[PDB]
Design a protein around this ligand. Structure first.
Ligand code: SF4
Ligand code: SF4
Ligand code: SF4
Lengths: 32, 90, 232, 232, 90, 232
């Protein structure tokens, strides 16, 4: 089904982006 | 639409920064300058006179002896006399 | 703790609950509009839902994300209303995108509606059991010819604002004309461009020194006459 | 270069390899616990795997994301252990959630286990052919009634540490008690506060000048008595 | 490949920063110091002598009296001499 | 507005469109190469497409992501080229990975190609109606044994450049050799390490005071002789 998959993928992408922001701002990385 | 997933878990992502910041929003340290050296900018006191322009009206809440923001400063010639009739000079 | 009465709290724990109805009130009186009452669903008589005597008309509405939090940014729930026949755009073009208005969400259980909503009549009616929330509209991110999406925010939201809101000196003033700080209450003498206007329909102050002199209230001038603190 | 022996290196290039076994050792002796040996697999006799004489009992375990890098953030591989019958919860509330311990991962090829793991008996056995890694547990990100997830980190990780670890001066000392810099070895005289005592159990130093005066050891005080340099 | 799904229109996603920002690119305010007090210097004024060590040579575009970057400063004994022969020191 | 002729704009109004054709020109003269002409498709005769008299040979080329904007970042569209038989790798190993070249994209409608592309012969041919864009190759993000991806950029894009190019130095020059400031046109006298040579192929200034003294152009030295401004 379209809309359910779209909303699920959007929320999962938001969670992934939040996790990436959290993990890259520790000591090194590119210091976002 | 009847059922909704999308739950994740916020019990681990938000602890990652520290558990004490969870209950208190933590304070804000100022910026250290080379001239400031050991001294750190105090948001509770500033013992000096600052230029009026480019400043913002400060507020006081309790005690805290403090300087000011100078608005007018000028040097003139003083009057030779206190008042009344006592005007001895020599 | 909430102000929910004992009876609804008791009923909410029951194994066989009833329908959960949500009603919405859009208030624009603080902006210059009217009070609009919406409900997502109607009764069995094909009539607007009657609650507390008043009638909520059945119109498109759906909210998502209403939540209370303390960490990070403030919560911004999203409202959606179907814009058919141009009804939403009609008030949008007149009320400046419905910004600054108030939205009140009322949540009620089905077994407490007015008796006129049921063919047999509900004997368990008590029009004082509901849960109330209030928010303010922030922006209208979508006004397509099919729907309309609104962003909501807390009334006490703070951002883009500084605490000590005064700017020391200026050649110009900083108060508001005819307020409790300027203190002037005389007849019209000057206009925005500092011309001898005796008409009150277009009285304005240039907030400058000459405008203040025109009204003999230079004592209450907010700007300090330093100027030369930086040059000298 | 790695310390892998010649024979296992030769075997790893063979087209028809054998099974790969991963064995885990959790060491809490530096924290105050015991040594636990886990293996995701058992032998053909339904027995714990015997390696180098010791026995790795069959137990759920799975390591993921083992990465080594020189640039960017230090890698944090994860470990998953099934928490059934509350086995992990039994030590989590006792060992402070397994924080600070050590984990050792040894990988081995199936053709080098002890002969007791095979009904016919492996003749190609060598108990000195394995690859070893070590990490430290950082946090228990997830703990439920079905599983448990641990984050691993390098021992050398330098997160949240500052290089020059001296405060220079204060009204208070900045060392330990009875270390190799305080240099005190006498009988008990003071406690957490400035109260006389004569028991070794409650020997504590307030790390102020009064403690030094009590202990007749001031020449080793780690606080410069300036105070007025900031004022005057 | 014939169709291009997920059009993904961008409307308020760029308005959210402000509307004048998408017509004019705004300007960058300088950083505020503490030892500077309240003199809010900008990026196109300099009324003091600077030091020309490993720095860039400034440019000027119109009017607006400016300072400089000192390259050589030296003090010697002022010898007696004018544009002529009249050298009286009596 | 665009430099679009009236005829093509008039044709681009009708419902029954013709076939859109995209042709690419890779210009490497400014970097040290030749001009390559590519087309994604060939005519009905199985021949290279003839346009304006010149010929574009068939080769799999695909440009995606052309996004002209005034805010945010710049535009970086992607060009994909099939790398079979090692043809792209051949010039990449020679032309420094196609860095610094120019790419020109021309789009044309089918009904305006040369008559030799059609068996009946087009009577509507007009070799002056096309839309032209130009870009510069920035990097070869990935060139495998089956394909090759190039990133494009605008020629005038600023990134990593500073405005006040002037730099104050003590004992090192700032400009090139013989270009505009070093008004030297005599015989070669020096080399990289300030050796007395008289060969023109090895004449390169050392960017020092000694080089200027050797070349008798010390009056045109860019290094100010301050040095001792920070010691005192
Ligand atoms: S300027 Fe003088 S008059 Fe105009 S507002 Fe400020 S105070 Fe009232
Ligand atoms: S204060 Fe004096 S006694 Fe207490 S620790 Fe520091 S040095 Fe040892
Ligand atoms: S150093 Fe003197 S000679 Fe060498 S380049 Fe600069 S100016 Fe020309």
């Amino acid at each position: 089904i379209g809309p359910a998959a779209l909303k699920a993928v959007y929320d999962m992408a938001r969670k992934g982006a939040r996790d990436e922001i959290q993990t890259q701002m520790r000591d090194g990385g590119l210091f976002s | 639409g009847g059922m909704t997933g999308i739950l994740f878990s916020l019990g681990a992502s938000m602890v990652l920064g520290g558990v004490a910041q969870m209950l208190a929003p933590k304070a804000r340290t100022p910026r250290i300058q080379t001239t400031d050296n050991g001294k750190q900018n105090t948001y509770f006191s500033s013992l000096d006179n600052m230029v009026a322009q480019g400043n913002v009206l400060p507020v006081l809440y309790g005690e805290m002896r403090v300087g000011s923001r100078v608005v007018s400063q000028e040097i003139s010639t003083a009057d030779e006399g206190d008042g009344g009739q006592v005007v001895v000079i020599g | 703790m909430q102000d929910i009465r004992q009876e609804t709290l008791n009923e909410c724990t029951r194994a066989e609950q009833s329908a959960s109805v949500v009603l919405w009130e859009i208030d624009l009186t603080e902006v210059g509009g009217e009070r609009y009452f919406f409900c997502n669903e109607q009764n069995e008589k094909g009539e607007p839902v009657t609650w507390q005597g008043r009638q909520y008309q059945p119109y498109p509405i759906q909210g998502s994300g209403f939540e209370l939090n303390g960490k990070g940014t403030s919560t911004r729930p999203t409202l959606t209303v179907s814009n058919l026949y141009g009804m939403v755009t009609g008030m949008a073009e007149d009320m400046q995108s419905l910004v600054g208005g108030t939205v009140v969400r009322r949540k009620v259980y089905a077994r407490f509606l007015d008796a006129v909503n049921f063919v047999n009549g509900n004997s368990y009616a008590d029009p004082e059991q509901e849960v109330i929330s209030r928010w303010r509209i922030e922006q209208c991110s979508e006004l397509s010819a099919v729907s309309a999406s609104f962003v909501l925010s807390t009334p006490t939201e703070t951002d883009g604002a500084v605490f000590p809101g005064r700017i020391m000196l200026a050649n110009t003033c900083t108060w508001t004309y005819r307020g409790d700080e300027c203190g002037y209450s005389g007849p019209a003498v000057a206009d925005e461009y500092d011309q001898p206007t005796s008409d009150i329909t277009k009285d304005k102050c240039s907030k400058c020194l000459s405008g203040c002199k025109f009204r003999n209230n230079v004592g209450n001038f907010g700007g300090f006459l330093s100027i030369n603190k930086l040059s000298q």
